Design a protein around this ligand. Sequence first.
Ligand SMILES: Nc1ncc(Oc2cccc(CCNC(=O)c3cccc(OC(F)(F)F)c3)c2)cn1
Length: 291
Amino acid sequence: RVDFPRSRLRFKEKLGEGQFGEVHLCEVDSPQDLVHPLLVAVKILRPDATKNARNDFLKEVKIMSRLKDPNIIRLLGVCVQDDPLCMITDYMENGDLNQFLSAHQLEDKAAEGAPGDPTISYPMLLHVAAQIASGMRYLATLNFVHRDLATRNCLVGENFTIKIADFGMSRNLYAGDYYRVQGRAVLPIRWMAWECILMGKFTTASDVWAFGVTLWEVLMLCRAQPFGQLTDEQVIENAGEFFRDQGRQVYLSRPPACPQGLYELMLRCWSRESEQRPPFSQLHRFLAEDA
Ligand SMILES: Nc1ncc(Oc2cccc(CCNC(=O)c3cccc(OC(F)(F)F)c3)c2)cn1
């Protein structure tokens, strides 16, 4: 099945960089002809990319080809017949959600405002969170497990639209969010269900746990790291307390912006029993309909 026409991509700005690739903002004139212009993001494999990096790139494209939802990153096209390998996706103009919320302050306003405005309202936070829940609801229907849900992996577009993505665990900006040990998978422990930390297997139910923490982030306006006053080792030992179930495990505290009713739903996402955690359809309905 034919590549996207590589010649159509007019490169404008370099958005980001990794040791293997770089991401660019491109515009596409006359998107009408493709069966004023469209902005897209493209990830391109750098010419010095190892054999292993190329393989990972091709697998990433295949994985991404599964996912077709308004609130998940979308694979618009590819250029892989020739080099450099190219992956084309939605451009989300307001960047990653963690940096976005970090730059905002909470205000009680009836004005929807703009993503550029210095403040954001509580109803809008609920709307951000609902969109993530809706994305995750879709992934759950495919039994697709994300494994790294967090605000650093979400993107914000015009009019506060949200898309879930996955940028890997290697960005220096978020190094503090990962627990690294020689010979082991890198783990986002502060977002991980206890059974994930102890046994290393991920499920939709552990994605629900991570969503609870992602919700906590959003309601904190990303002002502080989950369990930020505790060390990595204490976070890992906390998973042990969940397993022993002697009532000594600890939870994230209620954000100021978070009403008690919503907090109680958040706490359910952190149920010891995976089966007692809310399904994403119920999480989505609560945020979309129940404030
Ligand atoms: N400004 C701006 N605008 C848009 C932008 O986005 C991208 C730009 C270039 C490349 C990508 C794709 C990265 N790969 C994934 O996201 C990925 C991979 C595997 C599974 C996966 O599952 C999931 F969708 F469920 F998460 C997701 C996104 C970034 N910056």
